[PDB]
């Protein structure tokens, strides 16, 4: 094609106008976005006491999937089907129901009375003092507990937007073996595995540039 | 009042007619041609010096 | 009276481009096209396209501003919004 | 005929 020519552009200093580039790293974000990002960074940077740092150790993907598979079969009654029961009871005038127990005060009382077979505790609770005492209480009362990721996930479990805690108290005969196997799996994967590591302080991480500077200083001091 | 007259009264028939005068237009034409020729010469000289070095 | 501004009256107010019509209707392009088909809104050709588009000769689809303003009151638009909420 | 509210239709094509 004789009509087309190659005319490269010089994008060096003192040259043609700079082209458009991805400046996402230099975006002046809104103040709420900046606040939340810096808050998460600060939580990473500061040295975290172990009682708070224990909530960063949660169930793995496979165990969490098995747990929620068990709990979704006991997902509580919705308001639409409750009216179907009340009309049926009015015509007669119902069996014993099985459902996931939820609500912070109710679950804490169940743990204190040793009625809860298994407890799931959401890790992203703000304020954290609502659940920061739950692992120690479960350990003292001998109630199997597991920290899981997602109060929204527990809310979908109990037909809410969010839920700080979920509890399985009574189960059917077709699921007692599954519940016992899940309790043993959580004991092997979460309690015994994270027993030592949850006693340590967290958040011992530097920033990127600080880590690079420390590495360069260590390399220079070790070798010229 | 320049909005009321025709384009003949506000221009002359030359490049930069109006905004710039004839001598300045001539000087910038000369400068453009000579500097472009010098740029070609300098690029050829730099390529030859890179090859010889 | 003070001197009026150009490109505000005449063709510039009589005709409105498709992008401006969509922006004023606050709908998507697909919804706008379906509404135009339902209501029988059809593109128009100004006699002075440079006057209608501020001296640009670029190809543009124009509509009547009164037609778009009448289209603003169609209940099918509210039905579309309700369907979006339902989805 | 006349408008009572700020947003009216009055149905004239």
């Amino acid at each position: 094609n004789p009509l087309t020519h190659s005319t490269p552009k010089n994008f060096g200093i003192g040259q043609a106008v700079q082209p458009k580039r991805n400046l996402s790293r230099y975006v002046k974000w809104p103040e709420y976005v900046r606040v939340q990002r810096q808050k998460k960074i600060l939580s990473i940077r500061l040295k975290v006491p172990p009682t708070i740092a224990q909530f960063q150790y949660t169930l793995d993907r496979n165990t969490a999937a098995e747990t929620f598979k068990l709990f979704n079969k006991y997902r509580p009654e919705t308001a639409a089907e409750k009216k179907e029961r009340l009309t049926k009871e009015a015509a007669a005038v119902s069996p014993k129901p099985y459902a996931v127990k939820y609500g912070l005060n109710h679950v804490v009382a169940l743990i204190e009375n040793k009625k809860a077979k298994l407890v799931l505790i959401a890790n992203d609770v703000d304020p954290i003092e609502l659940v920061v005492f739950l692992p120690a209480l479960c350990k003292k009362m001998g109630v199997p507990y597991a920290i899981v990721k997602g109060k929204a996930r527990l809310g979908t479990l109990v037909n809410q937007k969010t839920s700080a805690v979920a509890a399985l108290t009574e189960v059917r005969a077709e699921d007692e073996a599954a519940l016992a196997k899940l309790v043993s799996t959580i004991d092997a994967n979460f309690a015994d595995k994270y027993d030592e590591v949850k006693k340590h302080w967290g958040g011992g991480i530097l920033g990127n540039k600080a880590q690079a500077k420390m590495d360069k200083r260590a390399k220079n001091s070790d070798s010229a | 009042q320049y909005a009321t007259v025709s384009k003949t009264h506000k221009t002359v028939s030359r490049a930069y007619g109006g905004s710039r005068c004839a001598n300045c237009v001539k000087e910038r034409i000369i400068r453009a041609f000579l500097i472009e020729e010098q740029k070609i010469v300098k690029k050829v000289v730099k390529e030859q010096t890179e090859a010889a070095k | 009276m003070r001197i009026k501004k150009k490109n505000t009256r005449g063709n510039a107010r009589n005709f409105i481009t498709r992008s401006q019509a969509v922006r004023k209707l606050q709908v998507s392009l697909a919804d706008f096209r379906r509404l135009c088909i339902f209501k029988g809104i059809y593109p128009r050709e100004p006699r002075n396209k440079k006057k209608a588009n501020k001296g640009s000769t670029a190809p543009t689809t124009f509509y009547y501003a009164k037609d778009i303003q009448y289209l603003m009151h169609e209940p099918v638009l509210a039905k579309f919004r309700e369907h979006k909420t339902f989805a | 005929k006349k408008s009572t509210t700020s947003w009216s239709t009055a149905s004239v094509r």
């Binding site: 060096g12 200093i13 003192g14 106008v17 700079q18 | - | - | -």
Partner: protein
């Protein structure tokens, strides 16, 4: 006691600067990528007089590196700079009068002006007519430069601080007697309300502590 003029001047009022006829604040370019890494060329379009300032100023036009347009800067004219001259500003700029260079890139004994106190403040030292800053030495380990100021003081500043090669134009201004209260009047009319001055001894003890007798 009554408030003296020295205390009165702090409230502003009639003691503010007369700035109607000023050309604009005299500053270097903002320290950007081009000046940090390479250099950038501008052109001296005109050299103008600034009301209330002894030294002339120079309008220098650069090209915007990130947009197709022109940027006009107001520099303090060094002696020897002319209209149509090319000015180079950056770390890689040459050692010629009128160029803007970091202090770490010039040798000892270099004479500069409009010197940054900190890297990026766009000129703070040796701005009046006839004044200059002398580059005494360098400390590469701390990335510092020792300089001598017009008052005779010795200072240590960053090697990334910028300065303009040469001496500020318009020197020798104060060697001419004014001869006239009228010429002093026209001098301070373009600066501020600090003339004429009344002696404290000539006042009353209420007006000034030096008053009375």
């Amino acid at each position: 006691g009554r408030v003296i003029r020295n205390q009165r001047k702090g409230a502003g009022s009639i003691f503010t600067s007369h700035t109607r006829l000023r050309q604009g604040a005299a500053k270097l370019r903002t320290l950007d990528y081009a000046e940090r890494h390479g250099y950038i060329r501008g052109i001296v379009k005109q050299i103008v007089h600034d009301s209330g300032r002894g030294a002339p100023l120079a309008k220098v036009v650069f090209r915007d590196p990130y947009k197709y347009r022109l940027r006009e800067e107001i520099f303090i004219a060094n002696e020897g700079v002319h209209t149509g001259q090319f000015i180079y500003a950056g770390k890689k700029a040459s050692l010629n009068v009128g160029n803007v260079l970091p202090l770490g890139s010039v040798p000892e004994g270099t004479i500069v002006s409009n010197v940054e106190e900190k890297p990026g403040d766009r000129g703070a030292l040796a701005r009046a007519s006839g004044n200059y800053v002398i580059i005494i030495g360098h400390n590469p380990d701390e990335n510092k430069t020792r300089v001598r100021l017009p008052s005779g003081a010795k200072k240590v500043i960053s090697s990334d601080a910028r300065g303009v090669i040469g001496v500020i134009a318009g020197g020798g201004r104060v060697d001419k007697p004014l001869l006239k209260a009228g010429r002093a009047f026209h001098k301070y009319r373009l600066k501020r309300n600090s003339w004429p001055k009344t002696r404290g001894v000539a006042m009353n003890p209420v007006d000034h502590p030096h008053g009375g007798g």
